[PDB]
């Protein structure tokens, strides 16, 4: 229901989006563009890395998962920077940014 | 509170 009216932003529905691929699926269905229940992409991509850091993405030792949080959410730049820092995953950032150059 | 458990 709220998928399809985009509707109660505030509930993760955590029953069935129990994966973070599902959360920012179910988030993406509910963002808008131009007061109350509402939420917009500038409002969930600040709001997902500025309270929820990548402390609260990599807990698990895998970065991979916060990239992606990062990348389907149009900040580019921060997880260029954040996945140039695994010095495991130096090449995969450089390239990254490169195709975006 | 969203999780953090990767799709696996």
């Given at each position: 229901?709220?998928?399809?009216?985009?509707?109660?932003?505030?509930?993760?529905q955590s029953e069935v989006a129990d994966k973070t691929?599902?959360?920012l699926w179910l988030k993406l269905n509910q963002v808008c563009f131009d007061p109350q229940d509402r939420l917009?992409?500038?409002?969930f991509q600040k709001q997902l890395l500025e309270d929820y850091g990548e402390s609260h993405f990599t807990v698990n030792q895998?970065?991979?998962?916060?990239?992606q949080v990062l990348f389907?959410?149009?900040?580019?730049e921060a997880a260029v920077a954040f996945l140039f820092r695994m010095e495991?995953?130096?090449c995969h950032a450089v390239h990254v940014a490169l195709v975006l150059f | 509170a969203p999780p953090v458990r990767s799709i696996y």
């Open positions: 229901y709220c998928i399809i009216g985009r509707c109660d932003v505030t509930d993760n691929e599902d959360y917009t992409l500038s409002q895998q970065p991979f998962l916060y990239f389907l959410t149009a900040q580019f495991r995953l130096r | -």
